[PDB]
Symmetry: C4
């Protein structure tokens, strides 16, 4: 990534690995190691993502927000 991977990975039902980076992004990586998508927050993503029953990926950011990201990498909502 662009910075330290302090965040702890979460694994989706299909094997997708989600993890934050201090480069501000939440990453979605396929089991083969190839990027699926990345989503930019406003600050380091130390928080470790959680996966909802419908696949939604939730993760905090040092920009003060809790993010909810759709499985396709598009923002669902954010909470300050």
């Amino acid at each position: 990534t662009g910075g330290s991977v302090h965040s702890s990975p979460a694994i989706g039902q299909d094997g997708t690995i989600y993890v934050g980076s201090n480069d501000h992004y939440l990453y979605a990586i396929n089991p083969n190691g190839k990027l699926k998508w990345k989503f930019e927050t406003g600050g380091s993503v130390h928080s470790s993502p959680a996966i909802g029953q419908d696949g939604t990926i939730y993760v905090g950011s040092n920009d003060h927000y809790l993010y909810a990201i759709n499985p396709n990498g598009k923002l669902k909502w954010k909470f300050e």
Copy 2:
């Protein structure tokens, strides 16, 4: 929130997302992104919440306490 979301979210059986913030609060957010409740501790909530079998939400705080919060946002007990 009011500060960095270092804490890692926990997801309840009904989809409620619980996460701490460096603004001192534990947040309970509905799947639609609207606040359910927030509970103020005495310091940054870096710790990541855990959910008990009866729904109780446990989380540490930089104020030295482990908190046990009822699903409705009211304090159950705290331990120094």
Copy 3:
């Protein structure tokens, strides 16, 4: 506790809540909020405990060791 609860709680099958503290201890707290036991390591217990299939509680410490603690609070082994 004696210091910041950075560690994230783990919940045993019987409801016991395990969490580390920057005061160097791993805590085992009953669901009613009363202490079951505490185990002293050599440094801040930032690491968040994990629970094995046989109930063993594993947690790292800033003293360089990974600890394995029996459900009764007695040391099983530690690894530097």
Copy 4:
């Protein structure tokens, strides 16, 4: 280990305990406390490992990479 165990342990189906250390290594320790293997990254392994459906161990490192390690301790891939 060689440094602070900030990372939080993960437990495999066979009881193996996986945890990172600030000494740069991801550790795989048997339930009896004896080392199974260790894998060196380029920086502190604060991230806490996750275990895939096929046993793969994923963990971030302060060297910017997300690592995927085979159950035998050999690198599967890494992502910057």
